Amino acid sequence: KLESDIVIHIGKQEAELALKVNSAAFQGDFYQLKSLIRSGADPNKTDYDGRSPLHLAACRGYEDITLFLIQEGVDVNLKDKFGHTPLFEAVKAGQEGVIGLLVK
Amino acid sequence: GHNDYKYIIHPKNRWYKAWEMFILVWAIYSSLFTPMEFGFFRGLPERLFVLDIVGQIAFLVDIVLQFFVAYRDTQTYRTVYKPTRIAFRYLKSHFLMDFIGCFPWDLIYKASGKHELVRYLLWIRLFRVRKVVEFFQRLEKDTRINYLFTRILKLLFVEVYCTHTAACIFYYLATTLPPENEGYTWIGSLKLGDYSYENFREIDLWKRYTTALYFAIVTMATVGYGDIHAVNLREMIFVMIYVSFDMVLGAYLIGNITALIVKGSNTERFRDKMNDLISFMNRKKLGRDLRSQITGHVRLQYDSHYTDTVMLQDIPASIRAKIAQLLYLPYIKKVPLFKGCSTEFINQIVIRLHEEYFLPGEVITEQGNVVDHLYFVCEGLLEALVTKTDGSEESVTLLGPHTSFGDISIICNISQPFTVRVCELCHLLRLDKQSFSNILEIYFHDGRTILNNIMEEKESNDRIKKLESDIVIHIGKQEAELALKVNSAAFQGDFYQLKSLIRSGADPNKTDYDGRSPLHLAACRGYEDITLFLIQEGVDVNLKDKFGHTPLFEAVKAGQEGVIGLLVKEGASFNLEDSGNFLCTTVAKGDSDFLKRLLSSGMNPNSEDYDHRTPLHVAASEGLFLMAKMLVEAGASVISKDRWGNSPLDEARLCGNKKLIKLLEDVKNAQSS
């Protein structure tokens, strides 16, 4: 019965993980993110708006978080549900270093 | 299992305890009389004929009862109550010796022609002293009496028995020699004072026993007056054996007493510390008040019994938890930080707690030190101060009893703000940061209720109002995470759960990292029930998201005409930046359905693009008669002209679409009027 409750609870919990991964890519908690990569959902798993945390890392400028996502191999060309690759938010936000990383 | 087989007596049953105290008296008498009746009586006189018989009967019943009393196992540690199991314990452990002792050995000796070797079996009754051994073992368990004190008392009883038996054996050895050679015995040549023990077999039993026991006792302490001494060779040999064994026994007595004095020093440790510490004060001439403070601390070390709080680390987690639930729980209720939360959350705070005691004047937490423990002042007063750049300390609001300090720093995960000082003896209950953190993660609703209590506690003390800004940073982090949960629910379908969260305090106008109120997500998903509920919560129909869209934008994206009409009844209107130019881009897309839902929301009839072309221009040039007619229905005028002065009618005429040409011709010619 508990297993059946967690059949849905773990799905919701995975959703929370993806949102938290984006949050940590939006607050700046790198160390938590390094732990969470092996202790939580992956950046490939998208949120409600289908936005990988690489899009946020383009906005914020957490190029070290960006480099961790690069190590994971998460598609740098993975668009959001707004049909826009993280490169666009890199250019829009004006993070020239992040722009350089995604050009690399 | 005690019902399974009846007549069984519990090991510590009341009536069995009374019988134990009775058979203990009988065992003491039997073990202290067997040597007497052996040595001083070559055949027990009939005067005591009753008293021996009843004695054996007293143990005979005990041979039966021990076949029914249960015994606590040493393997499962559980009392086993089965006569099949119970009987074996006796039959193996001690039944043989007790049964041999219970025979009428004196009568058998008198019924076998007075053979002394039969009387030697009387010494089997000395094994009844195992009852006294059991009594002493049980008394050792009692915390009433010290273990080492019980040891020394046991050794004293061992000396009592050994001297009594030694005196009896000594007199018996005197009797083994024939009466005519009684002058060669130790007693038959005794001439104490003017009394010669010449016919020593006819002297009163008590005079003979007192002489023999006098010898035994004076040799027990090795006084060795010499008035009574061994004369025979049997007497010499027995005195050597007794003396050697008693040397060992007396050495053990001295060892037990010395160990009791050395190890068993409780307040003497405080006294020893006082010795050299008073030497310290005296050789350094400390002020009397400061001397009093130091002595107060040392007495406090033995008066706070922190060791009595350290032991709890050894008691297992659950039982310690219930100790906390019975002691720290009132102190926990007294905390204004918790105040009204779920009883389960309060109970979990209760479970993981580490009571501590501190000293007046000594400081507890230091400024700039990362908070590692969450302290509650339960009985005491506490005052924090902050050293400034010049160095002077900043007095803060005092922390009197039934308060919680350091909590704000833990909540913000920041170092301790002020160096806090212990004004006097305080019952500082402690909670580790990690334990509190996990408890908060499990009880998130209680956690937010604490957050409310926290804001109130912030305005309560202005010195924490010096850190309200950082606390507000933490509050904003909590609100952002909460908006994340609200949006995630709007994407999952947890309608009632997200309603409950909004009831909890969740503003649906809270913006997430995507900055789109959950109305956008409910619209794009199509949870029209959730969209309607958010409508009742007064979410603005067309909030602009970080991406510059409305909730109804997302609805029209997926074309949730249910949600689209739902927001239309609320007066749905994109009112987006360049919504008419976005319609130029939509005619570029060519999505007539997307366009129909947009123009049903009616954001803009027509607007010139960077080519100064209304969407009607684009549709007319493209030959998109359906889109162009639908735009005209929206209000797209045909008199508008592009950058090159061409109306949509001109574009349609260029295209050559008969229906579109006729439509735009008639509409624009009418529009001219």
Side-chain angles (χ1 to χ4, degrees), chain A, chain B residues 1-79 82-673:
Chain A
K1 200 283 302 179
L2 318 159
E3 168 216 305
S4 325
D5 309 306
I6 76 183
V7 160
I8 319 176
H9 149 88
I10 294 186
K12 314 162 41 53
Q13 161 36 269
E14 201 295 335
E16 305 155 2
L17 276 173
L19 268 57
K20 182 178 182 59
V21 168
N22 304 1
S23 180
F26 204 86
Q27 324 322 99
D29 209 356
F30 183 32
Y31 201 94
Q32 192 201 5
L33 211 63
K34 327 182 321 322
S35 173
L36 273 193
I37 286 298
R38 275 301 290 211
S39 325
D42 39 296
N44 299 295
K45 305 299 183 180
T46 55
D47 59 357
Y48 24 85
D49 289 309
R51 306 187 60 241
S52 71
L54 192 52
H55 300 92
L56 295 190
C59 164
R60 303 300 286 183
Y62 306 151
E63 317 198 4
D64 183 27
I65 287 180
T66 299
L67 188 53
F68 226 59
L69 317 181
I70 291 169
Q71 304 162 2
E72 306 316 298
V74 178
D75 191 3
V76 287
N77 275 298
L78 248 179
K79 330 183 192 185
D80 55 3
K81 288 180 184 176
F82 296 84
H84 254 284
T85 64
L87 190 79
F88 144 65
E89 311 72 306
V91 170
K92 194 43 42 193
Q95 293 276 0
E96 321 78 314
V98 176
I99 295 169
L101 320 195
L102 293 64
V103 167
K104 150 195 176 183
Chain B
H2 87 267
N3 300 0
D4 306 1
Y5 323 87
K6 63 183 313 301
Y7 305 113
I8 298 314
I9 304 98
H10 292 269
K12 64 153 181 213
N13 172 61
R14 194 161 201 121
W15 301 93
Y16 194 44
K17 292 310 297 177
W19 174 260
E20 284 274 61
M21 181 145 198
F22 167 85
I23 216 60
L24 181 61
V25 162
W26 271 106
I28 292 164
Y29 169 87
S30 209
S31 51
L32 282 176
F33 178 58
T34 282
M36 201 156 308
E37 176 275 347
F38 173 78
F40 297 89
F41 291 120
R42 294 283 260 260
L44 183 44
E46 309 83 342
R47 146 83 159 276
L48 322 156
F49 165 79
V50 197
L51 191 73
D52 63 78
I53 272 286
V54 180
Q56 311 318 295
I57 286 296
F59 297 88
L60 200 42
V61 183
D62 175 280
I63 266 69
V64 152
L65 304 182
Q66 212 59 40
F67 274 129
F68 308 135
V69 307
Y71 61 100
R72 179 177 97 73
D73 277 4
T74 323
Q75 313 91 300
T76 182
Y77 301 53
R78 184 198 63 241
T79 299
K82 302 168 49 61
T84 69
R85 287 265 52 240
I86 271 171
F88 174 110
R89 170 187 53 122
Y90 209 167
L91 294 168
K92 212 289 305 304
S93 319
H94 322 117
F95 185 38
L96 178 64
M97 292 305 168
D98 249 344
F99 190 34
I100 307 314
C102 285
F103 296 161
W105 275 132
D106 171 61
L107 167 60
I108 304 184
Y109 157 85
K110 274 161 62 193
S112 72
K114 303 273 212 85
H115 282 17
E116 184 54 28
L117 266 275
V118 188
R119 229 169 47 95
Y120 271 47
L121 290 132
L122 269 157
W123 286 108
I124 278 306
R125 300 182 171 176
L126 255 192
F127 275 167
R128 298 164 149 159
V129 84
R130 112 197 183 262
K131 302 300 198 313
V132 191
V133 172
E134 312 303 62
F135 159 85
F136 270 144
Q137 289 179 357
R138 303 194 312 239
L139 173 64
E140 280 174 357
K141 263 74 77 178
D142 280 53
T143 88
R144 320 184 62 182
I145 281 314
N146 191 299
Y147 173 58
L148 281 168
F149 179 88
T150 315
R151 268 297 186 180
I152 73 101
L153 223 34
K154 295 166 54 177
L155 265 307
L156 260 327
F157 284 35
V158 171
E159 302 255 58
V160 152
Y161 281 90
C162 290
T163 61
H164 166 80
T165 61
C168 297
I169 292 151
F170 203 38
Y171 177 77
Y172 175 69
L173 292 180
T175 69
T176 66
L177 272 200
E180 65 257 25
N181 283 359
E182 85 194 342
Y184 202 20
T185 72
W186 65 269
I187 178 148
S189 58
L190 203 54
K191 211 252 177 186
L192 294 193
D194 63 302
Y195 187 92
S196 37
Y197 289 62
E198 290 274 51
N199 214 1
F200 72 93
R201 286 156 220 256
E202 273 68 31
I203 313 183
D204 301 23
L205 157 78
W206 290 121
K207 180 157 179 52
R208 277 149 35 196
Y209 180 59
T210 310
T211 279
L213 196 54
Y214 171 87
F215 173 90
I217 298 302
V218 308
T219 62
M220 178 202 46
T222 81
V223 200
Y225 291 101
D227 58 335
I228 318 196
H229 58 266
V231 185
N232 279 326
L233 252 52
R234 35 173 62 89
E235 279 139 51
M236 267 142 189
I237 286 158
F238 159 77
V239 171
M240 304 169 5
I241 300 155
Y242 178 36
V243 152
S244 306
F245 163 84
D246 202 330
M247 167 172 26
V248 186
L249 207 181
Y252 249 90
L253 189 59
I254 284 183
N256 281 247
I257 293 282
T258 298
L260 169 60
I261 305 161
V262 177
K263 156 69 183 301
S265 304
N266 182 58
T267 315
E268 182 275 300
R269 306 168 314 240
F270 141 70
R271 216 293 184 256
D272 170 61
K273 249 299 179 58
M274 271 315 97
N275 224 27
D276 36 25
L277 202 43
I278 265 58
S279 310
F280 173 94
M281 301 146 198
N282 244 4
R283 64 161 171 280
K284 295 177 174 302
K285 303 63 181 173
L286 281 53
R288 160 193 171 180
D289 54 357
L290 176 58
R291 295 177 174 243
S292 82
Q293 215 178 323
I294 308 186
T295 64
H297 183 216
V298 172
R299 198 55 186 119
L300 170 66
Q301 293 173 58
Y302 295 87
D303 277 56
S304 56
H305 11 88
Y306 38 85
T307 66
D308 305 7
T309 315
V310 169
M311 33 172 72
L312 329 180
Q313 273 78 15
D314 278 52
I315 317 144
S318 64
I319 329 288
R320 163 142 40 61
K322 187 282 171 173
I323 313 183
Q325 295 170 359
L326 172 63
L327 259 298
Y328 307 153
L329 163 154
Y331 303 100
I332 281 307
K333 302 171 178 177
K334 294 332 171 283
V335 171
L337 191 294
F338 307 143
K339 249 175 52 185
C341 290
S342 81
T343 206
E344 291 325 326
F345 174 86
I346 302 176
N347 264 357
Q348 319 323 88
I349 329 304
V350 152
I351 297 181
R352 304 161 201 51
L353 279 176
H354 174 162
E355 185 179 3
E356 298 189 1
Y357 284 139
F358 280 55
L359 170 164
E362 165 253 356
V363 306
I364 168 181
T365 61
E366 323 310 275
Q367 73 174 50
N369 167 59
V370 176
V371 282
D372 290 357
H373 297 323
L374 158 53
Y375 283 130
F376 312 169
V377 156
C378 317
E379 161 206 10
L381 179 168
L382 212 63
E383 179 178 359
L385 293 95
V386 197
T387 282
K388 320 162 32 53
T389 60
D390 58 0
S392 58
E393 295 180 359
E394 300 162 59
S395 58
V396 317
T397 303
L398 319 89
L399 316 160
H402 323 331
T403 61
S404 60
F405 100 102
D407 85 304
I408 267 65
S409 187
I410 284 199
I411 291 301
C412 317
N413 306 296
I414 170 182
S415 65
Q416 168 70 11
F418 349 101
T419 301
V420 183
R421 182 171 318 178
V422 187
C423 295
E424 62 265 0
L425 182 153
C426 34
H427 182 207
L428 296 190
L429 190 31
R430 184 197 85 177
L431 172 43
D432 290 0
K433 35 172 181 53
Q434 185 58 61
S435 310
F436 183 37
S437 308
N438 330 290
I439 298 194
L440 292 167
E441 310 128 19
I442 324 295
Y443 307 93
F444 68 55
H445 29 282
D446 301 300
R448 322 179 309 91
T449 311
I450 306 125
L451 167 71
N452 193 57
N453 307 353
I454 292 180
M455 71 204 47
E456 317 147 1
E457 204 166 0
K458 304 283 306 179
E459 315 107 8
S460 79
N461 164 205
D462 311 301
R463 284 90 191 200
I464 322 160
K465 284 161 51 185
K466 108 179 61 181
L467 291 203
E468 287 208 337
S469 178
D470 174 1
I471 245 300
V472 160
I473 301 177
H474 171 89
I475 301 180
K477 128 195 175 181
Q478 287 203 358
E479 216 47 8
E481 182 294 336
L482 175 158
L484 295 200
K485 334 176 48 55
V486 173
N487 288 30
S488 185
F491 177 89
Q492 293 174 0
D494 250 359
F495 174 36
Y496 302 143
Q497 181 268 358
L498 71 83
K499 305 170 66 179
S500 325
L501 172 34
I502 302 195
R503 296 154 192 175
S504 306
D507 188 2
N509 304 299
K510 284 311 320 163
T511 52
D512 70 305
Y513 55 88
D514 292 339
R516 8 222 279 111
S517 94
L519 192 58
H520 310 60
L521 314 184
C524 67
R525 215 51 151 118
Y527 304 153
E528 319 189 1
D529 81 76
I530 307 187
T531 303
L532 280 176
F533 155 49
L534 292 171
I535 290 176
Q536 338 162 21
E537 251 282 284
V539 187
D540 186 1
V541 184
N542 312 298
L543 291 173
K544 295 332 181 153
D545 50 49
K546 168 64 183 301
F547 314 71
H549 305 145
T550 63
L552 156 81
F553 204 120
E554 315 309 282
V556 185
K557 273 179 169 175
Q560 309 277 1
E561 271 285 20
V563 152
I564 298 172
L566 283 181
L567 303 180
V568 160
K569 139 193 68 170
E570 317 311 301
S573 62
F574 275 56
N575 298 358
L576 250 203
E577 303 178 359
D578 314 301
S579 66
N581 178 59
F582 159 83
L583 285 171
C584 308
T585 306
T586 301
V587 179
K589 204 53 81 193
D591 300 1
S592 63
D593 51 358
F594 190 34
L595 176 77
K596 84 191 184 304
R597 298 163 304 185
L598 296 158
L599 294 185
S600 303
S601 302
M603 338 81 83
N604 160 306
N606 57 301
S607 294
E608 289 189 0
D609 159 76
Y610 20 86
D611 312 355
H612 307 332
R613 305 194 56 182
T614 67
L616 194 62
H617 281 94
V618 189
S621 58
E622 276 290 301
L624 299 173
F625 160 88
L626 295 181
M627 305 234 285
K629 87 152 190 46
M630 178 202 258
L631 249 68
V632 167
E633 298 160 1
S637 186
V638 206
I639 73 173
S640 60
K641 288 190 171 182
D642 62 1
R643 171 156 207 173
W644 309 261
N646 317 301
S647 72
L649 171 50
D650 302 303
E651 329 288 1
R653 291 184 179 182
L654 291 177
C655 170
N657 192 3
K658 305 183 179 179
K659 46 170 183 169
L660 184 52
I661 290 190
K662 168 188 178 181
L663 170 75
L664 295 195
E665 279 189 0
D666 305 359
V667 175
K668 188 188 174 187
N669 290 304
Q671 282 187 0
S672 75
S673 60

